[PDB]
Each structure stands twice: as C-alpha cells, then as structure tokens.
Paper text:
The Spike protein (S) is the major surface glycoprotein on coronaviruses. These characteristically trimeric spikes are subdivided into an N-terminal S1 domain, responsible for attachment to host cells via its receptor ACE2 (Hoffmann et al., 2020), and a C-terminal S2 domain, which is anchored in the viral membrane, cleaved from S1 following cellular attachment, and responsible for membrane fusion and cell entry. S1 consists of an N-terminal domain (NTD) followed by the receptor binding domain (RBD) which mediates binding to ACE2, burying ∼860 Å of surface area at its tip (Lan et al., 2020). Most potent neutralizing antibodies bind the RBD on or closely adjacent to the ACE2-interacting surface and function to block interaction of the virus with ACE2, preventing cellular adhesion and infection (Dejnirattisai et al., 2021a; Yuan et al., 2020; Kreye et al., 2020).
We determined the crystal structure of a ternary complex of RBD-L452R with Fabs 253 and 75 (STAR Methods). The RBD 452 mutation had no effect on neutralization or binding of mAb 253, and the structure confirms that the RBD L452R mutation introduces no significant change in the RBD structure and that residue 452 does not directly contact Fab 253. (G) Cartoon depiction of the ternary complex of antibody 253 (HC, red [sugar shown as red sticks]; LC, blue) with mutant L452R RBD (gray, with sugar shown as sticks) with antibody 75 (HC, pink; LC, green) used as a crystallization chaperone. Antibody 253 makes no contact with R452, in line with no observed loss of neutralization. In addition, comparison of the overall mode of engagement of mAb 253 between the two differently mutated RBDs reveals that the 478 mutation induces a modest change in the pose of the antibody. (I and J) Close ups showing 253 interacting with residue 478 in the two mutant RBDs, revealing a modest shift in the binding pose of 253. The L452R mutant RBD is shown in dark gray, with antibody 253 in crimson (HC) and blue (LC), and the T478K RBD is shown in white, with 253 in pink (HC) and pale blue (LC).
Residue numbers in the entry:
A (entry chain R): 332 to 516
B (entry chain B), C (entry chain L): 1 to 214
D (entry chain H): 1 to 138, 144 to 224
E (entry chain A): 1 to 144, 149 to 228
Write the structure that this text describes.
Amino acid sequence: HTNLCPFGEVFNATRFASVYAWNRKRISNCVADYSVLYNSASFSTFKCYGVSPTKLNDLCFTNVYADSFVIRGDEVRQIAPGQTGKIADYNYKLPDDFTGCVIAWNSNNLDSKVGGNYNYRYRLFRKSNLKPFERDISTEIYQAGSTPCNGVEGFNCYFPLQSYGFQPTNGVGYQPYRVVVLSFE
Amino acid sequence: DIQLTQSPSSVSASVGDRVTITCRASQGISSWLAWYQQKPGKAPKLLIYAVSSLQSGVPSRFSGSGSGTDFTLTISSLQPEDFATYYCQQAKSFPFTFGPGTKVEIKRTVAAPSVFIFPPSDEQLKSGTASVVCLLNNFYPREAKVQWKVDNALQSGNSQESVTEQDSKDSTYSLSSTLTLSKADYEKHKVYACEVTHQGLSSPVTKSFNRGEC
Amino acid sequence: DIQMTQSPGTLSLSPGEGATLSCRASQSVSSSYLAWYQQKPGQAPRLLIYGASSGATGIPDRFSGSGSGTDFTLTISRLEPEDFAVYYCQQYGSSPYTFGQGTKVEIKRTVAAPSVFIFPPSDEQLKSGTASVVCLLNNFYPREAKVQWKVDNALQSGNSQESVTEQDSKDSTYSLSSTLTLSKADYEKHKVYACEVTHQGLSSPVTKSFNRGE
Amino acid sequence: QVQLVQSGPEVKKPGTSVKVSCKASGFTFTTSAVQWVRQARGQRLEWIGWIVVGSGNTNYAQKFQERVTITRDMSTTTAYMELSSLRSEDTAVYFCAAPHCNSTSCYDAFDIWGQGTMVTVSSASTKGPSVFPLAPSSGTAALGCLVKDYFPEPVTVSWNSGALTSGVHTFPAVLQSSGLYSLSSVVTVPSSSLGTQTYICNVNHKPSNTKVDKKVEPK
Amino acid sequence: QVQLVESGGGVVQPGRSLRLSCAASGFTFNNYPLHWVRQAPGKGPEWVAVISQDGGNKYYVDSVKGRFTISRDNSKNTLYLQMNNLRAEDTALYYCARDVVVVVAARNHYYNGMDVWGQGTTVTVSSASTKGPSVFPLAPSSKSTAALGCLVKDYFPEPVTVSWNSGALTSGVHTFPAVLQSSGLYSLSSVVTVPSSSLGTQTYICNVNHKPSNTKVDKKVEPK
Ligand SMILES: *[C@@H]1O[C@H](CO[C@@H]2O[C@@H](C)[C@@H](O)[C@@H](O)[C@@H]2O)[C@@H](O[C@@H]2O[C@H](CO)[C@@H](O[C@@H]3O[C@H](CO[C@H]4O[C@H](CO)[C@@H](O)[C@H](O)[C@@H]4O)[C@@H](O)[C@H](O[C@H]4O[C@H](CO)[C@@H](O)[C@H](O)[C@@H]4O)[C@@H]3O)[C@H](O)[C@H]2NC(C)=O)[C@H](O)[C@H]1NC(C)=O
Ligand SMILES: *[C@@H]1O[C@H](CO[C@@H]2O[C@@H](C)[C@@H](O)[C@@H](O)[C@@H]2O)[C@@H](O[C@@H]2O[C@H](CO)[C@@H](O)[C@H](O)[C@H]2NC(C)=O)[C@H](O)[C@H]1NC(C)=O
Ligand SMILES: [Cl-]
C-alpha cells in the first residue's frame, strides 16, 4: 500500500497497442503522485472527468484501470464521454458517468515511419456502436450492402481494420499519439 | 543517423548447424528491419523484411525475430548455398543504414600455410623499384599475420596484403603480401624475410633469401 | 479481366414492340453484381437494373432483368418513345468492373430517301484561300448512306469528312453533312462539282452538282 | 437531393496532367465508393478504376495503371481522378459514380452519377469560328451556316434567335487535321418564303466569347 | 521477368560529372519508389538516394547532398542518378533497387527495404592516367611442392585478367585481388603451386590482359 504505482511501465512502455485492441493494466494497492503528471509539459492532453485534475492526490478508490492505445491527434478529442466518431463509436467508448482522466502525448518519433507505419490499425466499420469499455478484435468482412459477402472482399464488402500509415512528414493532426485512460472504480 | 551493429563478425559453421546472427540498433526501430544475403561478385539478396516476413522463394529454414533495438536471423539447418555475408538494414528513417555484416564461413580442420618468398626480379630492378612477395598458400582459419624484416629490422607502413575468397575445394584461404622498396634501399641490405604466424604453426615460420643468392 | 459483350449492336424496333437486350460475361459472374444502364445522347448513364433482376428506384415496371452466370437479359415489355437510347451492362463484383460495348435501341421506320442539296463555297470563304463544298442528305432512313464527291468527273478520296445527326424525335430520320475541302487554287482549276448519293430509298444514285460561278 | 457534381470542362496540352473533381452531397460520403468511367465521343463506357472512401484503397484497370491515380478527401466530401501524361487519345468525357449510403449501409449498385467532365488534349489554341453562309439554290429549299475553324468544343447554333426550329439540323462537328473543328447547321424552308423571310443563324462560342449573327441570302 | 539493368559507369577525374541510368522491366514501374545503393571495394552496401513513385519526393545521404540528383522517367521506365563534383570516396559499384512495398488491409506502405537489385555499374573517381601493367616473374626457388607466379604491377584502371598457359593451366592457381597503391595504380599477384619435380620439366606462362590500355603481356616464369 505504501509502494509506488507502476505508472512508469505504463506511460513509458516500449510499444503501445492499436486502438481497436486497446490494452488494460489493472492497478491497485499503490500510491502515486499525480501532481508531476499534471505538471508535465510532456503530456499534450490531461483532462479529467468527475474528479478535479488539480486535486487528484487527495482521493482514494478501490481499483485503478490504465487503458492505453494509439490514435492520431485529430481523434484524441473522441477519447471523452459523450463523443462520437470513428474511435468513439468503433474502437474505444467511454461512459457518460466516466470517473477518471484522459492523458495523451505526441508519439511521432516512436510510431511514425518514413513511407508509413503498418502496425497501428483502427476499426473503420461496425454494425452497431460499442458499449462503454467494450473490446472488438474480430476480422469479419463488413457487409455494407444487402448482398452477403462470403469471406471475399469487394463492392460493399470491406475489411474492417485499416492501417493508420503514420508518416513523420504528416500534419501533426495525423501524427501518432499515445493515449492513457485512467479510471477509478 | 541510426547506427547498426552485428554480432558476431564471422561464423564458422558446417552443413546442418543452427546459425543465429544478431543485429543491434542505436535506437528503437520497431519492426522496420530487413535482412540481406550477399555472395562475392553479386548484388545483395533480400531474405527477410519487417523483421519476420520471408521473401518469396526464400527457404523456410530462414527466420527472423526481434523488436526495437535487438533482432535475430536464424538458419535452422545450414545448406551449402547459405555460406555468405548477411546484412541487416533499418528502415525507420533516411538514410537507410546497413550493418557491418556477418560472414558465414565453412568450418574445416586447421591447416598451416605454405610460405614462399620471392625476391624482386631483375626485370623490375632495371625499372628502379623492388617488390618482395610473401605467399601464404592454402591455410585455415583465415586469421594470419605477416611481418617483413630487412636485415632483421622490422618493417612497417611499406607493405600491402590481399586475401582470396574461401576456396571451393578445400575451404582454405591464401594470402599475398608485397613489400615495396626503391632500388636504392633494396640494394642497401642483404637478408629479406617474411615471418608468418598462424594457428597451424606452433611458432612463427620464417622464409628468407640472401640478396643475389642464386 | 472478365469480358462483357452485348447484342445487338443496334436494335431497330417500332414504338410499342417489346425489346430484348443481351449481356454476356466471359466467365460466370454473380447475379448480385450485374447492372443495366440507360444513356441518352449528351447525358450521363442512368441505372435501370441491378442485381440482375432488381429494378432501380424510379424505374418503371416495364423494365425487367433476368439471367445467371454468363448470360443476362434486359427486357422492355412495351417500348415507349423515351426508351430509345443506348443501354450498357456492367459487372461490378470482380475487379476490374468491365462494361459491355452498348446496344442502341432505335425506332424502326419505312425506308425514306434523302433530300440532297449541294452548297458551293461562299465568296466570303474563297477570300480566305480555302474552299468548302457541302453536300446535305436530309431526313432519311435507315442510317446507311454513301456520298461520293466528283470534281470534273474525278472521284475524290481522302479530302472529305462526314457527320450524322441523332435519330429525329418526330420522323425518326437521320441527316448527313459531307464537306469537301480544297484550296482556292485547286477549286478554281475545275468547273463541275457534284456529290453522288447512294441510299436504299433511291433506285439509282442521285447526283447534285453545280457549275463554278454560274 | 442525393447528388454528384463534377468539374467543369478541361482543355490541356499534350503531356500535361488533368485532375477532375467529384463532390458528393445528400448521402454520407464516408461509407461509399467512387468509380471512374470515361467515354470517347461516340464510343462505349470505359471503366478506369474505383476507390473506397473510408479506406482510400484503389483498384485500377490495366490500361490506366500507368497514368491514373484516384484519391478522395473526406473533409471536402470530394473524390479526385488525376491523369498524367495526357495525349490526344485521352480526349473523352469522364464520369464518376457512387452508391448512396447512410451511416452503416449502402445501395447495391452505382445509382448516383456525375454530370460528366469533358477533357480535350491537343496542341490547338482558343479560336473563334468563321461562319460562312450556305445559300439556297435557284417546293422546299435548304440553307444554313458553316461554323468553320474553331477550338475548343463546343458551339451553339440557333436560327432567328429561336423563332425557327422546325426542319433545322445542326450536325456534330468534325476534327480537321489542322486540329480545329468545323460544324455545319442547315434548315429546310418552303421555296416560296425565300424572297419574303430573312434567315439569320446565331453562332455562339463561349470559349472565345464569339457571337456571330450571319444572314443567309439566296444566291 | 522483374529486372533492373544499370549503365553509365566509368572512370572520371575528381570534380567532374557522370550520369547513371537504370532500365526496368517486368513490373509496373510507376507503382514503386526506387533506390540507389553503392558498395565500395571490400566494404558493405551504402544507401545513396531514393525517389518516390511520381518523383515528387527525393532523399539523399549526407555524403552526396547537393552533388547528386536522383530522377526518373515513368514513360521510359528509367531511373537516373546525376553525379556531379565527384570525389575519390565516390568510387564504388552502383546498384539501382526497387522499393519493398508492405501491404496491410490493401493499403500500400513504402520504404521497407530493397528487393529487386541490378547487377551494378562501376564508377571510379581518380586522376590516374590509363596504364597497362608490367608483368614480372615470381620465379620458383631452387630447392624450396613449389610456388611460382607473376607480379602484375602498376596498372590503372581495374580490371585485369590473368590466365596461365592460355587457360590450359587452371589447377592450383591463385589470382589475388588487387591492392590500390598510394601512387593511384593497382598491383596484383597471380601464383600457382606445383610439385617441385615439375619445375624443370613443365613450362609456366602467365598471360595478363588489360583492355583499357589495349595491352596483352605474356611472361615465361622459369627457375633461376
Ligand atoms: C518516462 O521517461 C521520461 C524520460 O526519461 C528517459 O527514459 C528513461 C527510461 C531513462 O532512459 C532516462 O534517462 C531518459 O531521460 C521521464 O522523464 C525524465 O525524468 C528524469 C528524472 O527522473 C529527468 O532527469 C532530469 O533531467 C533534467 C534536465 O536534464 C536534461 O534535459 C535538458 C532538456 O530538457 C537537457 O538540455 C539537459 O542537458 C539534460 O539532458 C535535470 O535538470 C535533472 O537534474 C538532476 O540533477 C540535479 C543536480 O544537477 C538534481 O538536483 C536533480 O534531482 C536530478 O537528479 C534530471 O537529470 C529527465 O529530464 C526526464 N525526461 C523527460 C523527457 O521528461 C519520466 O519521468 C518517465 N515517466 C514515468 C511515468 O516513468
Ligand atoms: C441504413 O440503411 C439500411 C438499409 O436501407 C436500405 O438501403 C439504403 C441504402 C436505402 O436504399 C434504403 O432505402 C434501403 O431500405 C437500413 O436497414 C434496413 O431497414 C429495413 C427496415 O426499414 C429492413 O427491412 C432492412 O432489412 C434493413 N437492412 C439492413 C442492411 O439493415 C437502416 O435502418 C438504415 N439506418 C439509418 C440510421 O438510416
Ligand atoms: Cl471497361
């Protein structure tokens, strides 16, 4: 209980996960100093919900979940309650009563590659919207029309996962961003 | 620039061995690494890209692994067509950089070199320059040292060496070292010797000649 | 690539008759990825039928579709005047999404002989150093017609160009314009300029001429 | 108002590039796809390629892989077709087509089509036409005008400023070996009216801002 | 067959210019970026430049920045490398190579390696004048299997070809790679090992052929 939280292996992890396959680290029975995170110019985004971001140190919860993934800058605004879009609807949904924080930083120097990176993907199509904290990693062909595909792609039959193609020369709004979502239950 | 190191520098293997080569990057490059094979007098051949993706036609005995700064190329059972130099290339950012290479060599029994010394010919002496040649013939392993001595005086900075590729018949190497003096300096001394140190020799072997001696 | 061919090239029917168009695929294609389009001169394609046998929104029920595999059919139960146009089929399941070469549905009519007129080059144009003789074939059916220019009984070739209008919406006839082009020098070297018109409606070729100047 | 509006007419010298735009409206562009089809004057429909809007993935035909690239910009709901190394054989009208879609589902065919885009490729320069009269010969007579030596297409021709329509034929133009176009328009009128009715053809060429009203007189 | 063929190499004085060309066939040329890779004698490959599909993007190694220019002709399926103000350390064998395109979910990703390589074309930056070699005998010793050969000294540029007895003698022959001397001329030795008995009863003639100087020298090697 008197030990440090393993935030270092979370924020400074060598490799992050794709947003559709977002990873979760369970964190309990630890004490952290959230003031050095809020004070960090390294973090491009530090937005908390249901709890003051300037007074995080004076709180206690039973468990802490640390969800992390990679999106592009223009999509960081979707990592918030009540948001809509490709990421919010098809990749990572936060609840309206979400109690936690959303942290993100530019990761162009790590996750961009000249010619376009192929490792990070996002879900482009889905029949229905994701429930809050739902995880969908299926690779079924999306039937956009009324005629059934049969595992073959084509007209109105599209693979559901698409590569971001992160390039260092991209506009910053298209450069890769590493996100960390802290929730307190 | 992203630096790349390879280990080991050379590998002495036999048909059937499990050979593993490593490649280290000065910074993380995720999955953006390729492996190339090169035989003497040929362009490099792409074997692996994206760390672990076999190029079309490459035998499945080749495999690749790693992420970030450390990467591995593994040949399960070495075949005679696999003896070559292997390079790793990063593709994170320009410039594309290559590793120093790892030469996969044929293992064989230790063989001591046959040493011969050649005085400069009379035809060359009339040209005003003298070249003494020391031949190390058919030896293994490749490592060898040649020292020129002119009347027991150790020479430095006036010799050049050249090694043949590993022979396709006995897997040995051969070396030719040439000491170069002017006609004036060559005629100022008498005893010319090259001393050869090699693993197959319990002690350095010396071959000499006396200037003018038939 | 999957080849799509259509038949007939031109379908000549009277208003009220039933039309039947054909579409062939070089290999079996899925019925749910074949379409029929209608195109009027100077317009964009209009989707009529998709999924082989599914009518598009706003298309009258007189349009129908059938077929499977390599053979498909477009049937118009009762041909309306607004239905005379060009019709294409497209397969859009296997990339590339190839088209057929089109079928033009025209109004059939009684053979009508053309009204032939010849026009000498105007004095204003001769002022420019070039002469254009125009031969007008007015309101005829069917479309097939032959024009031959004769300059002092010399049959011309390679110095004329033709142009045909679309089928008229009132009398279902076509019109043709042929232009003979000579320099002012060559035109003034001859006297009689005539264009001979051969057509199904003429028992023998009709000739219209004029004498230069007169 | 499910619509697909394309770029205006294009006239490019040989060897340059043309990039035609195709903007969508009415449906949700993000979940559809846009194919491109060209059509030479008097020929059949020619499939060039297609693109999926959401992913940007493309498929091209063999004939156009070398000189055509299809792109789209979801922010401006517009798909583009760039054709490089233009030549005379590229002269045609180009169409774009897309199925209309909502946020999750799409129509089972290409039901939305653009108006078309004329691409002309040659070394010719903008030039108005010379209009010469086709006078009637000495019960019905024929007369007209000769719209000669203009570039580019098209020209419009009316008679008596629209009062005369019956019996008028304006033929499609031919491309002369000089690279210029020539057009003839005619009209058949009763022979009796030749001396008591003035006939004037109205030739207008917008690319060169040419308005010629030429009266046809019996010669 | 997928193929790249280089041309345009040669000998060039320092500071002058050369232009290399790369002929492609067997693949859709305009769908691929293309690289220039060089390899100095005895060293590893060095990446030089790359050009995108349409030619809009170009990247260069710092060693050639401002001196080299890469370009392509998509109508002619040809890649170029304009080499200006050439330095000695530009001497190498120059390959052209096709980019490795990685496809994930039907989306292309470029600059992932070089899969198709040409045979290479050699450029040699030096102010040395073309010179045929001298051929000096390396005579076998009296009593010291024996060894003999020919010293092929002071020639520019590469290469030479050395045969023994007009190609009839091939066993036991070692023609070593040449060293570059401080003078700017190459030196090479070609030796043969034979039983000691065959010294006075078998003739050994080395034939050195150097095309750039239009010379062919024959040298009888014989005991002293
Ligand atoms: C996630 O990692 C962050 C980065 O750390 C890097 O990664 C780890 C794995 C190591 O390799 C480490 O060496 C890397 O830097 C990490 O933030 C880092 O936190 C450390 C403190 O633990 C910071 O060190 C301090 O740096 C400043 C500035 O030094 C450099 O920065 C400037 C530019 O910003 C350069 O111009 C300088 O030349 C330096 O290169 C120092 O002032 C400071 O002072 C120390 O010494 C004085 C005495 O002089 C003492 O009074 C102090 O107490 C210190 O002992 C430290 O050296 C480091 O700057 C910082 N880096 C970044 C990028 O933020 C972060 O904490 C990690 N997060 C988690 C959750 O794990
Ligand atoms: C989104 O559209 C689907 C499908 O609608 C059909 O296709 C469209 C492109 C358009 O052509 C419509 O006129 C078509 O009806 C809707 O799902 C359908 O809903 C009907 C009941 O209304 C049902 O019978 C079908 O089976 C459904 N088909 C599928 C594939 O789900 C859907 O409701 C629409 N959603 C929204 C938010 O508009
Ligand atoms: Cl087609």
